[PDB]
Design an enzyme around this catalytic site. Structure first.
Site, PDB file in Angstrom:
ATOM      1  N   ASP A   1      18.489  -9.379  -8.711  1.00 29.83           N
ATOM      2  CA  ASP A   1      17.413 -10.318  -9.096  1.00 29.83           C
ATOM      3  C   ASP A   1      15.969  -9.778  -8.903  1.00 29.83           C
ATOM      4  OD1 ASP A   1      17.073 -10.584  -6.300  1.00 29.83           O
ATOM      5  OD2 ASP A   1      17.462 -12.719  -6.284  1.00 29.83           O
ATOM      6  N   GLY A   2      15.862  -8.520  -8.478  1.00 27.22           N
ATOM      7  CA  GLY A   2      14.558  -7.921  -8.258  1.00 27.22           C
ATOM      8  C   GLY A   2      14.071  -7.808  -6.827  1.00 27.22           C
ATOM      9  N   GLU A   3      14.719  -8.473  -5.886  1.00 23.66           N
ATOM     10  CA  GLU A   3      14.254  -8.405  -4.493  1.00 23.66           C
ATOM     11  C   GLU A   3      14.567  -7.057  -3.870  1.00 23.66           C
ATOM     12  OE1 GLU A   3      15.712 -11.942  -2.422  1.00 23.66           O
ATOM     13  OE2 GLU A   3      14.353 -13.070  -3.691  1.00 23.66           O
TER      14      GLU A   3
ATOM     15  N   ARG B   1     -10.540   0.444  -6.290  1.00 22.72           N
ATOM     16  CA  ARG B   1     -11.691   0.171  -7.158  1.00 22.72           C
ATOM     17  C   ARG B   1     -12.103  -1.296  -7.082  1.00 22.72           C
ATOM     18  NH1 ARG B   1      -7.577   2.098 -10.166  1.00 22.72           N
ATOM     19  NH2 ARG B   1      -8.350   2.636 -12.219  1.00 22.72           N
TER      20      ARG B   1
ATOM     21  N   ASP C   1      -8.150   7.486   9.887  1.00 20.99           N
ATOM     22  CA  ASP C   1      -8.673   8.836   9.804  1.00 20.99           C
ATOM     23  C   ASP C   1      -8.698   9.147   8.323  1.00 20.99           C
ATOM     24  OD1 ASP C   1      -8.951   9.416  12.638  1.00 20.99           O
ATOM     25  OD2 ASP C   1      -6.768   9.552  12.724  1.00 20.99           O
TER      26      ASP C   1
ATOM     27  N   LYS D   1     -23.956   6.465 -19.777  1.00 20.94           N
ATOM     28  CA  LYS D   1     -23.444   5.655 -20.869  1.00 20.94           C
ATOM     29  C   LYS D   1     -24.034   4.311 -20.542  1.00 20.94           C
ATOM     30  CE  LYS D   1     -19.472   4.009 -21.226  1.00 20.94           C
ATOM     31  NZ  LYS D   1     -18.810   2.697 -20.939  1.00 20.94           N
TER      32      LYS D   1
ATOM     33  N   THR E   1      -7.156   6.217 -17.419  1.00 20.80           N
ATOM     34  CA  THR E   1      -6.848   6.284 -18.851  1.00 20.80           C
ATOM     35  C   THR E   1      -7.520   7.513 -19.451  1.00 20.80           C
ATOM     36  OG1 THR E   1      -8.780   5.096 -19.768  1.00 20.80           O
ATOM     37  CG2 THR E   1      -6.944   3.764 -18.848  1.00 20.80           C
TER      38      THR E   1
ATOM     39  N   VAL F   1      -8.804  15.664  14.828  1.00 16.60           N
ATOM     40  CA  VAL F   1      -8.562  15.591  13.400  1.00 16.60           C
ATOM     41  C   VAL F   1      -9.799  16.039  12.649  1.00 16.60           C
ATOM     42  CG1 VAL F   1      -7.941  14.061  11.444  1.00 16.60           C
ATOM     43  CG2 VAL F   1      -6.815  13.756  13.666  1.00 16.60           C
TER      44      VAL F   1
END
Lengths: 298, 306, 298, 306, 298, 306
Positions: free
Chosen positions: A35-37, A94, A139, A188, A210, A293
């Site tokens: 069922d998608g789960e 975004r 980080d 633009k 795209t 780091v």
């Protein structure tokens, strides 16, 4: 004591990282019922262990986001010591500001903490202030140095870095600093602001989706005097007609990293893919062993 | 349908069940709120509400059905969008609650997804929830915000009552559904029987009209096997019903080829247009949910309903 | 480094557990002033220690709940490293769903976390979804295997497990699986659904409170052909006339565990009490040492 | 007493002080909300509200007095019940705040129970609190929800003023109550004196009418010892008063056998019906709390009161 | 593994403490830009470290409060293991109760936890219930024993401890217990309650701010028969004309601790300053090493 | 200015920008709420609201400008005070958001102060925020409470439009401000140019009127260096503008001695009375913020504004 798991987004990147650090990926089970789960089952005791989960929230973002959250839930409930999230590509980045829109980059952050995440390791977030969307440690790794090295090794004469728009100038300049080159930008409103006559242009962005923006900029550069056009990004989203648009463009070579798995489907003709595998494997070791780091940025 | 007269009640529909959502709005007397839920090429969902809802009480109608992950995400993003646009309240009407099954896989180190969802919904910013036939009634305890839980059994019962049936026995498909079979048996003053698949039958089903009831019918393996064993043990006839028609995989072919005289379901989940069930009846929860939203909004007693 | 404390609910169970794991119970003080208020004082430094508190929330539930919460507060404020709650019997577990009622099983859970609890070890919660009422780790132990072993050793012919109602069929079946027996159920709407003629019936429930339900079911079985009736539960609440009702019933023997202290007062004639002492002592060790707790279920 | 005219104001009483709760409701002009707080044989508390309160502003009146643990629990369960039934607000009127004493045991590793209670009340779902004479005024800081703190001293003062007394000295029973003795001394333009039990007296009490004031009188050991030492040091007479009559243990016998001319208390705590104080006066906080609830509900200034 | 940082409030106290425990203060940077904003930068990796921050929230309280909060934020975001706050003087402690006033002592507490604080070590909070304003662990140190020792060593005959007001009697009595002396109190409604004829008075308070209260009490004692007046407090706020008022008063000697840096500016003639440096250094060691902190009170 | 007619709208001013706050209140039509923000000798801030605001919607106007730490603290204390006095809502109008700069120091282990502030404001108890020209638009994402973000560019644009200028080019002072220069360029249908200080110029500025725009002008080093290099590269003239006049350090002398024909700023930050800018114009955000508060309070569309 360090266990690394991978989910469906980018299994190959996860494997490369695991090989470098020197562990076998954890035993987990990611079942999708009819069922998608989705159901995750940790196939081994991880009680008291520091667990790392490698997942890019790429196409389909919502499936990848949910399997990551459900997995964090299973580890939290199975008494993991820490649940550290490694995110090569941060989807919805975004959606970082509001006219009656959500701020999905912030929603995800809140969702992640709610589910039980301990900390995050990220790579090239769309906006540096997205770090501030979290209250758990994060980080942030940069990909510009990786793309910058490759170009520094190509023996390109007369270069100008080009920002495809108004929001990409800062990024363009970090690359232009590394390469000692001037910058031009596309305005633009599509006008070219800056000197590109006879120059070898390198169009740079964080994400190439795209590819309309990039291919159009590329066409504009070439009919305004540019000797040649190169193009790079950290995250290759490449959805819809992206690939075709790039193959027919004037773009000499497209350089991307492997933060997002490449379309099994469509092929890019002039292309080069760099690996963030070593960067992440190394960041994982230093985080886990509590080394510095930031030594990774200089 | 403009007639409601409280410009302050807004109702939005996401993609799970637009038809049900349209029916509810129509009944209430208001037009669906204006917004656009689009999916860019990369699969990211974009939402932008097209009219000010600042200060309005907003109702979002979304079943988290196949695919549950997409439907959960658009629901969460929708709530973030309304919260940030200053909605007064963000009320969630969930006709079908995905991930409510806790036993699906019989393993050790599992997540409790129905609980994770509740935490996520609250974090996104939900004010309250209106739910219908949750798989286990204690899922209500998963929330710390108000949740009103509606029952679908009366609707089903009323339908079977109207058929004027003789010698009926309400059959529980498995061990976990005996309480639910009992509720229908009370509405129909009928005894109960249960299928002990370990596939035996506990109760007298001989020469009787059996009515199989479950909350969800998914692959239909359980209900059809239970209908067949029923007939071959002397049941004169078999009806089957449930609130949520998940009907995944071979569900339909299995049902069409079974001995079930008629399958009765509600419209809490959008049906596959692709394949048709032959002996089938669909009851509507539109009026039930519409009545619930009105009483919640106006502060009237809704327990009166259910 | 592991310290175990006991409060007033079931001091003997706590002691048995402490002896098995090999520690002396912690030095705490539980004073009740004359006006009814309670004060706990930790009589030793527990700074940096992992503390386990053993408490069933049995009669009086509200006193037991408050002394447990006040003790967690004192340990949290005295800098305990972890505050692990061991709950043999979870009171208010029957208040797990809503007509204008509270969901007290959920309220307690929230209260426990608010007070400072780190994790919980539980035994036979009224409903398995009560695990989901927590966001802190919880390891749920089952008592059915313990009751099931005892019956497997009684040389009982022709058995049928009986669920006293509609909500107990799942439990009945776990016992019927372990014993290879068929199930029957009581349908008080009081009809007997299933074959029990000549059979030895074992009535099973999680909790035996006033015993009205159980003794009535037992009487009904016997006048419907049952050869004999046995009865078991994990939690012996046995309040009010429970005991008397059981002594006069047709119940051959009542089998319970020691998750709840037995009424000092009233005595059960045909009875057997099994200890969960070893189970909990063992679960405590594995949780503390981070071994696999699920090894305890198979 | 039906006369209030805002069907939206609901008032509930739990078991700590039903008489006080009835008086407040009567004064306000409303009937006590309908509910049942029952205790099954196992001591578990069951609550079920008998009328819809969805959208109503609910007021719960509960002193967390002996036994404090039961009273706290029924209070917490009551709030969970109202939260889940969609009350608009859940306002807590606590005439007496149990566990407000922080010094009771002079130990190291102690809990701060008055703070734990505040956290629990907020977690259960309280919207606000109305309290009366908290043992330490900084307990207000224990809450992050609004708390309005009422003072009982004016009521006591007004009573003593009406007695037309000469040469009075307000006596503080111990070191912690000097600020409170000072407030009464201001109302009565009288000097103060304090008992330094280490049992000496700091101040001139000779040939004067002494008035001992404390917030709570519990076992009465402190107040009676302080009254006796007062008389034997030349005080002409001794009155004693407090807001909260906990009166546990031998309190009563101690008072009846002491030199206290008259003990004055309020009805914030229900009195033992069992034993009688001989020289005693009880002032009511019903009108004070009733006035507080009305101003809070209607959004009027309550600081004006106190 | 233990790192101690100091901010601007009381650098000398911080240094004294660091010398005693045996560490160099951490490398941090506290810049104030020209527009007034502050920026802290941790000049060394503190990942995995237990960090202690020494800061009194003294004049200017709001600057000291913000630099402390901003520093906690930087350490939390730089992956510190723990962020332990050492507060010699707790500003806004007098704002501990409400007519339409805030309860700033509580607001700060909430702010501190929100910023990321792990625990607190405090010294003489204005009110003991301010400990209850926190939900993170707090160890409260007392200064009365330090002031009490000094007076016990002065060979003072006939002493009476004096509370400058109604709210200071409890404190007065703790000092009178330690010194075996009677207590008197000032009742400014300004009457002297208690016997002070011929006695050597010691006026005690927690904080000496403008010193109006103390100098006035001192003048009143002397014209009511007191042989001599001494005065002490733990926290020397001494703002405005405090110093002048004390120099001209009848106060023989003023004794304070160094929880607050002394005005570089104005000088006190008859004065003695005791150090809480050893107390805090010792409390830091025991907290970090998980020894008993309460051993410090008896 | 009493004329508003919703005694339920209260507006308070703290110390950052009392003049702007007075102007807004005047325009709205209400008198500034009564309170006293005093600073004892020790620098601690004391606040006590002088009129009941129980149940009122309160608006606090505070820019967190120099000194940002004091202004943040009085703001936080003010909110705690209103929360505890039972205000219905506590709305924060921040004309200038201090610590919004994230790049100031180019270091490693830094705090993200703009995020810490958001968390602190929410913790204190803020209901919502109204902000103006945040340094980075994603700071909106730092809040989980509603935040309405107003834009100052239209006001600036409208002013320059009224000057009837020829051959204009909008100049971005640095790489981060190109999006903002673009918005003005759109309002004025003008092309853009950027200063690439690494100090080169990208774009044709020759013989044109250049308009430099930034969000904040602080020490003025960047804008003045950019104006000078502009002129010496052939720009016919140079105007400079920004929303927030921080003007710290030598800002003023630098501006007065530069080639900037006229500096245009708003009144979001109070100007130094001490030193005067010679060629200067100040546009007011009073009407813009006043309009925003009214639409937020009455639940009208404010996106319409911005």
């Amino acid at each position: 004591n360090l266990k690394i798991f991978s989910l469906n987004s980018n299994p190959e990147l996860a494997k490369e990282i695991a090989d470098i650090v020197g562990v076998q990926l954890g035993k987990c089970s990611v079942t999708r019922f009819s069922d998608g789960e989705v159901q995750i089952n940790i196939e081994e005791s991880i009680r008291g262990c520091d667990c790392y989960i490698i997942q890019s929230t790429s196409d389909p973002v919502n499936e990848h986001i949910m399997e990551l959250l459900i997995m964090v839930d299973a580890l939290k409930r199975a008494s993991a010591k820490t649940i550290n999230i490694v995110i090569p590509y941060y989807g919805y980045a975004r959606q970082d500001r509001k006219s009656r829109e959500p701020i999905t980059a912030k929603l995800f952050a809140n969702l992640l903490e709610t589910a039980g995440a301990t900390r995050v390791i990220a790579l090239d977030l769309h906006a540096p202030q997205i770090q501030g969307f979290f209250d758990i440690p994060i980080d942030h790794l940069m990909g510009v140095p990786i793309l910058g090295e490759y170009f520094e090794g190509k023996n390109l004469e007369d270069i100008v870095i080009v920002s495809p728009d108004h929001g990409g100038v800062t990024r363009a300049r970090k690359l232009a600093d590394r390469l000692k080159a001037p910058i031009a930008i596309i305005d633009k409103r599509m006008n070219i602001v800056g000197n590109i006559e006879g120059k070898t242009a390198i169009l740079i962005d964080d994400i190439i989706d795209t590819a309309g923006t990039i291919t159009l900029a590329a066409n504009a550069l070439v009919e305004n005097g540019a000797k040649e056009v190169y193009a790079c990004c950290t995250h290759p989203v490449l959805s819809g007609p992206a690939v075709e648009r790039i193959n027919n463009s004037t773009i000499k070579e497209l350089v991307v990293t492997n933060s997002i798995k490449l379309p099994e489907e469509k092929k890019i003709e002039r292309f080069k893919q760099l690996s963030v595998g070593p960067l992440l494997a190394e960041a994982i070791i230093r985080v886990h062993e509590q080394q510095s780091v930031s030594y990774l940025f200089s």
